[PDB]
């Protein structure tokens, strides 16, 4: 097997982890457990600490001159790696094997993530700005200090980025569909419509098929048809907020005539290449600056409560019937979008 590592520029402080991407299952989330190695004589009288932070950060560490660092913190935990603390938090298999490797210059460290926290998410940096843009990120920091309030320094510390990510459930949910009856103010003659999907859950890039059905037993004409997929970011930071943006859509000129019936199936795909410059689009967790899929939809736990402390992101299809001379009507319906359980 493999282990990731990072170290201070002075080489006296080093941290090891087994994984960079941590899965959560809404009933359990993997720990960030690992080991930290230090020169026991270098530290002299300083103490070795490791600290997890999940922050609503903005800007980037590019040394740019930006309006940097809206450094809102959602959750922080600290652990005293050295001097040797008592038995809590007994070493796992991985930590025991790491200790067998490294020797007694190493000491174990541990965390557990609270359940009610987001995945890694990043909003797309608009081209008019410079550097990175805002998005909740996890960071693990390990450093030597005389006290937890003491001043930080490069030679004193090492800093590493990690991700928290979610994958598809083991079984699918009920089929997504909806319908509507646009009857007019008093006339019995009416317009009625339907739409439905293949599944509730889709892999990224896999085509969506939307069925559409129209029952226009009325005098008005459905002039144009549109199918759009909308992305919703339920951003919360101190107030509630929301941002919504279309990520793909297809038009069809196949009008529905008065006193008529119609049905069709439209195929649509969410993909990034044609949304390259759109600001406010939520991308999945970046390590440093990599490209990646449209943000996988966050799914709420069975015990929901509020669940929102950072970015919550979801998608919905909506179909619009462009009726001429009034009567315009539309329908919307949900779906989830994420990778399958790797193996």
């Amino acid at each position, epitope marked *: 097997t493999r282990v990731f590592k990072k170290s201070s520029p002075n080489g006296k402080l080093t941290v090891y982890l087994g994984k960079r991407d941590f899965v959560d299952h809404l009933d359990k989330v993997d720990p960030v457990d690992g080991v930290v190695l230090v020169d026991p004589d270098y530290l002299k009288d300083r103490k070795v600490f490791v600290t997890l932070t999940v922050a609503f950060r903005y800007g980037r560490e590019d040394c740019d001159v930006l309006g940097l660092s809206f450094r809102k913190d959602l959750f922080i935990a600290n652990y005293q790696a050295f001097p040797p603390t008592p038995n809590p938090p007994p070493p796992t298999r991985l930590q025991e094997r790491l200790l067998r490797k490294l020797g007694q210059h190493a000491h174990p460290f541990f965390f557990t993530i609270p359940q009610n926290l987001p995945s890694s998410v990043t909003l797309q940096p608009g081209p008019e700005d410079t550097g990175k843009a805002l998005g909740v990120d996890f960071e693990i920091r390990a450093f030597v200090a005389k006290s937890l309030e003491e001043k930080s320094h490069k030679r004193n510390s090492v800093r590493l980025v990690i991700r928290k990510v979610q994958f598809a459930p083991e079984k699918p949910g009920p089929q997504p569909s909806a319908e509507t009856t646009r009857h007019f103010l008093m006339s019995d003659r009416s317009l009625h419509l339907e739409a439905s999907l293949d599944k509730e859950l889709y892999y990224h*890039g896999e085509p969506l098929n939307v069925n559409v059905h129209v029952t226009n037993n009325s005098t008005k004409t459905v002039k144009k048809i549109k199918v759009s997929v909308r992305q919703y970011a339920d951003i919360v930071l101190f107030s509630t907020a929301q941002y919504k943006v279309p990520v793909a859509q297809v038009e069809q000129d196949d009008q529905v005539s008065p006193s008529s019936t119609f049905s069709k199936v439209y195929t649509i*795909t969410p993909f990034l290449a044609n949304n390259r410059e759109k600001r406010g689009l939520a991308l999945d967790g970046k390590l440093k600056h990599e490209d990646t899929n449209l943000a996988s939809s966050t799914i709420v736990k069975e015990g929901a409560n509020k669940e929102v402390l950072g970015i919550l992101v979801s998608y919905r299809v909506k179909v619009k019937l462009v009726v001429s001379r009034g009567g315009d009507v539309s329908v919307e319906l949900p779906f989830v979008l994420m990778h399958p359980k790797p193996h």
Partner: antibody
Amino acid sequence: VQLVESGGGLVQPGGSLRLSCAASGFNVYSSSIHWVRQAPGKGLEWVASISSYYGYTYYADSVKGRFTISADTSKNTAYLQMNSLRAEDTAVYYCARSRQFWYSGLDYWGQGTLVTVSS
Amino acid sequence: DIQMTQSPSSLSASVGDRVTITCRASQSVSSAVAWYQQKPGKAPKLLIYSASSLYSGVPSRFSGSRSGTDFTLTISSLQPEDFATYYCQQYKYVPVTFGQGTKVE
């Protein structure tokens, strides 16, 4: 699921030819198309690729700017323009599928077709 | 480029033997290596991906393992239909590179 490429045959030195690769049973938004080539009996080599989801394309330095790769995501099909052929580039050419999320080797391979260069 | 080399260029064995083939990277690539099998005159098939995990449908008598920056493909028990030529590649840097190739008889 299958991958097929066609259009090979005979080409002039200094001429050009266009090759096609039609994909059946997988989508060109949750996957990608790669091209690799093999002079007869030699160890094959990678030449070009197109990654439709991100929108990028890539090429080998021996061929950059001279070849070009393209695909249609409604016809679910890829094409590339082998321009300015020459003796160094005559070979058999394969088109191969890869997983997009995330790259796990070239696993569906077209039957292979060949590009002779001659008068 | 990340240059790639492998040895031996050719070898031979008998039915049931345990045989080794080695591929070596010119740079410290991670576990992002894959192996392919080519019969003469035919398109390939992938055998090993990510240097350890054997591909679905392959008989488990094929195998591979990472050793630092030397990648070893060994066949547990050779059978009368394994006689083909085998290739090695890295894949976490572009352009990808394919090895010089090897044969079995």
